[PDB]
Design a protein around this ligand. Structure first.
Ligand SMILES: CC[C@H](C)[C@H](N)C(=O)NS(=O)(=O)NC[C@H]1O[C@@H](n2cnc3c(N)ncnc32)[C@H](O)[C@@H]1O
Ligand SMILES: [Zn+2]
Ligand SMILES: [Zn+2]
Length: 1032
């Protein structure tokens, strides 16, 4: 073993260990050495390469590393291939800001290929930043040969999946009303929309719709989106609902019967009752006549019209509502659109042309009143969808898109999810399960440039569709030569046309790229270029035994994985999911926010070490709920856990070399009770940590280990230092080294998945082997002594009670005290075995165990004025004083009898009720008491001259021992000590001359009145001059 003497920072140690991993290929060998062992299949969720890693990203990568390392140590081969997510809006928008451009026109003017080259350069910069962060965090994952979603092989496997889906008829193009981002200028998927809801406050209005061929008759239409009014095509009523023609003032309004008293206030008279199918066909005048509807502006029947809200008459604009689109299409009404792709009004609405529709709400109200059509307005606080990337409000916009028909397999989705073990369990039928139950088809087409091209070619002649699964299939159908090096990106694939197999017409690729979530959801099949390569390796690496990512993936990777795999293969791609809560910064969620909530993880790793950061993330709180994180918790983890292990390890190394201990040599072992306790605590910790890890309880396993580390340092090592400091290699010293060597080897093995750097530093120095190539230690039940653990735990509580009393009464442990009395309610612990430990630790001359406190307490009596005040009238204070005058035995008799009589000064004797007297139990004179309820510790706090002088003698002994180290004197050299002090020190030294000689290797001791050129030292509140003249 090597030394720990030269001061090494945490960063220096981890850098040294990392280089040791590099030169030994330990990560690679920890996988190869498990060849033939059962597989544990793990998929890495690919971080988006669009920003710097933060501290919040260290939680997931720590948890993944713990599982992989732990599963490797318990006899599994865990292949770990890193991945980077490089396509889509999360990358495109960032690059646009770097270039100072925005929108599809700016990108096309910039040049599609030039813009894409900027995307490739940006993601490459972030991959290196992420890779450096991952390596220094100690998350072992293969970033030398990662899967990257922009690589041609990866995209080709995505094409094969999409083509196979298309073969099943589950990839279709359709004109549907979809969630749409006017800024990004593309439709969005259902899971993307579920990530961008915010509370808004807008206006829902009621508008008069004057009936045609009638006078003073106005329909009362209702809408939550006033900006859709210029595009009105129809009014919807429920055919079986009841409506009334009610006159109000000079006008007559048509409104639902059940809502009339709410819509019409002040004064109205109901004339006639009508059903919904009677009002069907009635025409009216639009609130805005800017646009013309060739077949529309009538009243139609829709079954979703509710009488609980609104007026029972609903304005329908087919281009901005799925229900509106359906009903208008059913009745053969004209489809009209007044909004461009940027969310702005077209020329068909002159007064607001070129304005965002959701910004015209205020002006729409004014135009309504000025045209004599407005009737009501009310506030609406509701959740509204916003773009999950650019935070723009979304619109529901009729648009032609490509869909994956996930609803066709919805039953298979739910079946696959039911086979998944979720952590926490509530995600399974909660956040994830509810999303599955409300499934709509997956809108995958994005009118963007950087992403996986949607591999569907349509014939210009007959609209026949061809979806090449591969470059070879693309080459086979192409009307021109397609080189083998064709890059599966825009615009390169846009220059490939195919000859139609039906009519020999020209087939052109649809221009869109696919949702970025499809890329990552395809990674089980695309990370190994399946089915083009690695068919056998893919089979051994599917499905995953676990994945672990943040809770946002329930609307992300968790869903896209499930959807791609179910559509492609029908099977669940994972057996188990760890859904991780998000890391917070004292409040908000860490992210690439404007505030930039996240801290620099590399700076923290540099300052406190990756081990400390990982331990804080694992032990401070569980990973399932939102986690407030602080640098302070990392600092505490470094000093309490990591530094503690290093010191104990360095303590073992220093004295093993000095004593020449060799674990390969055979010694005589006189193992003490403290050795048996810590060994029992070691294997009990091994058992309980393993049980937690088997159930993915990292927090509980870490906390169990931290308890053992505190016991190892504060109790076992601290109380065994003399055996390491002693001179001869006797049986008890050999037992100390043997015990501590086993503790360090096994504890480092226990800690390897948690704190891989410091664990390997201890293990490799002690054993010559990497801890990460080792087996996870097994519990040796024969070394578990439950009684010894129980008794020692009681001893620790008693010691803690004794320290509490000494601290309370300012009695430093260096000052011996006469006795400690322990009142145990029951004879449970064999206290005789631990008498020497308790007396040493608390510095008491006598330790006595009592069944009760009758000899250790007394009673004083008082009066409860709230109870007995009025009863005794004015003699109350005389009675209260009379109770306080009572003897000790009189007070004790009262608590037994429960009845007492006080004799006042006048000779009058008054009887005291039980509830009239307040009882106080006080410790005997000179004693002090602390109790937890199970154990009551009574400490004799009274000091005698002999106790004070012994304490002074102890301080003199310590002062001499410290001045001896300062002079660098040999350990074995009898000194001639000269000592000067006042009479109190002189008397104490004289009286305890034997004690001083037993603790100091003194050839002579001389008490001089004054000392030439002496060293003044502090002995309590006194100054003592010392001087050492080496014997000749
Ligand atoms: C599985 C990864 C997805 C396919 C996608 N590339 C993605 O979300 N990539 S990421 O880089 O933004 N996220 C990386 C991981 O970090 C989690 N995460 C993101 N934000 C936080 C946060 N504030 N606290 C804790 N964990 C968080 C993600 O869920 C993902 O596991
Ligand atoms: Zn957007
Ligand atoms: Zn054709």
């Amino acid at each position: 073993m090597k030394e720990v003497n030269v001061r090494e920072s945490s960063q220096e140690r981890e850098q040294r260990i990392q280089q040791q991993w590099q030169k030994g290929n330990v990560f690679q060998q920890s996988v190869q050495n498990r060849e033939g062992y059962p597989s544990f299949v793990f998929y890495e969720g690919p971080p988006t390469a669009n920003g710097l890693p933060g501290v919040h990203h260290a939680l997931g990568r720590t948890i993944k590393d713990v599982v992989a390392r732990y599963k490797t140590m318990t006899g599994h081969q865990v292949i770990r291939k890193a991945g980077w997510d490089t396509h889509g809006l999360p990358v495109e928008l960032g690059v646009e800001k770097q270039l100072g451009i925005s929108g599809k026109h700016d990108i096309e003017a910039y040049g599609v290929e030039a813009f894409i080259n900027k995307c490739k350069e940006s993601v490459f910069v972030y991959e290196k930043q992420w890779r450096t962060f991952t390596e220094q965090l100690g998350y072992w994952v293969d970033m030398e040969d990662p899967y990257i979603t922009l690589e041609n092989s990866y995209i080709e496997s995505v094409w094969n999946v999409l083509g196979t889906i298309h073969d099943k008829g589950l990839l279709y193009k359709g004109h549907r009303v979809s969630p749409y981002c006017p800024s990004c200028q593309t439709s969005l998927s259902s899971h993307e929309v579920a990530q961008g809801y915010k509370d808004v406050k807008d206006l829902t209005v009621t508008v008069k719709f004057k009936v045609k061929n009638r006078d003073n008759e106005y329909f009362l239409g209702w809408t939550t989106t006033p900006w859709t009014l210029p595009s009105n095509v129809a009014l919807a009523v429920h055919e079986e609902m009841s409506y009334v023609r009610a006159e109000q003032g000079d006008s007559v309004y048509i409104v639902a019967e059940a809502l009339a008293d709410k819509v019409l206030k002040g004064e109205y008279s109901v004339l006639s009752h009508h059903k919904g199918n009677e009002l069907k066909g009635m025409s009216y005048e639009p609130p805005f006549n800017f646009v013309k509807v060739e077949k529309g502006h009538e009243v139609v029947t829709a079954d979703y019209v509710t009488d609980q809200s609104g007026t029972g008459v609903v304005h329908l604009a087919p281009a901005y509502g799925e229900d509106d689109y359906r009903v208008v299409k059913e009745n053969g009404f004209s489809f009209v659109n007044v909004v461009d792709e940027k969310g702005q009004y077209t020329s068909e609405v002159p007064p607001f042309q070129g304005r965002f529709v959701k910004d015209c709400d205020v002006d729409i109200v004014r135009y309504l009143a000025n045209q004599d059509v407005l009737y009501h307005k009310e506030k609406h606080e509701h959740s509204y969808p916003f773009c999950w990337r650019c935070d723009s409000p979304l619109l529901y916009y009729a648009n032609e898109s490509w869909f994956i028909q996930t609803t066709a397999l919805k039953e298979q989705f739910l079946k696959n999810n039911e086979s998944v073990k979720w952590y926490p369990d509530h995600i399974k039928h909660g956040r994830f399960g509810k999303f599955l139950e409300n499934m709509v088809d997956w809108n995958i087409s994005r009118k963007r440039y950087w992403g996986t091209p949607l591999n569907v070619w349509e014939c210009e002649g007959c609209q026949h569709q061809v979806a090449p699964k591969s470059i070879k299939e693309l080459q086979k159908h192409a009307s021109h030569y397609v080189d083998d090096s064709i890059e599966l990106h825009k615009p390169y694939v846009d220059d490939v046309q195919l000859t139609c197999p039906v009519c020999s017409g020209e087939m052109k690729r649809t221009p869109e790229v696919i949702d970025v979530w499809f890329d990552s959801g395809s990674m089980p099949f695309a990370q190994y270029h399946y089915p083009f390569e690695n068919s056998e390796l893919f089979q051994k690496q599917f499905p995953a035994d676990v994945i672990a990512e943040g809770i946002d993936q329930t609307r992300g990777w968790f869903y896209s994985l499930m959807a791609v795999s179910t559509l492609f293969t029908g099977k669940a791609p994972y057996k188990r999911v760890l859904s991780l809560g998000h890391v917070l910064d004292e409040n908000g969620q860490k992210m690439s926010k404007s505030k930039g909530n996240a801290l620099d993880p590399v700076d923290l790793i540099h300052t406190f070490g990756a081990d400390a950061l990982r331990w804080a993330l694992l032990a401070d709180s569980a990973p399932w709920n939102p986690k407030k994180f602080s640098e302070r918790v990392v600092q505490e983890a470094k000093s309490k856990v990591i530094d503690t292990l290093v010191n104990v390890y360095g303590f073992y190394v220093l004295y093993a070399k000095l004593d020449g201990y060799d674990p390969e040599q055979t010694y005589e072992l006189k193992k003490t009770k403290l050795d048996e306790w810590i060994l029992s605590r070691l294997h009990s910790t091994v058992k309980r940590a393993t049980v937690h890890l088997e159930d993915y309880g990292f927090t509980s396993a870490a906390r169990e280990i931290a308890v053992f580390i505190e016991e190892l340092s504060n109790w076992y090592v601290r109380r065994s230092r003399d055996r390491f400091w002693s001179e001869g290699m006797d049986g008890e010293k050999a037992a100390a080294y043997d015990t501590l060597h086993e503790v360090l080897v096994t504890l480092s093995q226990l800690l390897a998945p948690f704190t891989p750097f410091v664990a390997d530093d201890v293990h490799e120095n002690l054993t010559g082997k990497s801890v990460h190539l080792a087996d996870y230690p097994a519990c040796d039940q024969t070394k578990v002594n439950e009684k010894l653990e129980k008794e020692m735990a009681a001893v620790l509580q008693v010691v803690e009670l004794g320290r509490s009393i000494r601290n309370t009464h300012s009695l430093k442990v260096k000052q011996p005290l006469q006795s400690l009395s322990l009142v145990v309610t029951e004879e449970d612990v064999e206290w005789k075995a631990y008498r020497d430990v308790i007396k040493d630790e608390l510095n008491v001359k006598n330790f006595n165990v009592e069944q009760d406190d009758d000899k250790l307490v007394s009673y004083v009596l008082k009066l409860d004025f709230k109870q007995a005040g009025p009863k005794f009238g004015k003699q109350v204070n005389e009675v209260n004083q009379a109770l306080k005058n009572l003897s000790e035995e009189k007070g004790k008799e009262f608590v037994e009898q429960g009845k007492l009589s006080v004799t006042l000064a006048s000779g009058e004797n008054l009887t005291l009720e039980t509830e009239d007297v307040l009882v106080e139990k006080v410790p005997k004179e000179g004693f002090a008491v602390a109790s937890n309820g199970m154990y009551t510790a009574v400490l004799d706090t009274a000091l005698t001259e002999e106790l004070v002088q012994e304490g002074v003698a102890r301080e003199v002994i310590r002062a001499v021992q410290d001045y001896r180290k300062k002079l660098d004197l040999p350990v074995n050299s009898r000194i001639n000590l000269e000592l000067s002090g006042d009479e109190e020190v002189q008397k104490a030294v004289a009286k305890f001359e034997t004690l001083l000689q037993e603790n100091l290797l003194l050839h002579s001791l001389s008490v001089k009145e004054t000392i030439k050129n002496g060293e003044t030292v502090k002995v309590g509140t006194k100054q003592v001059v010392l001087r050492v003249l080496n014997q000749s």
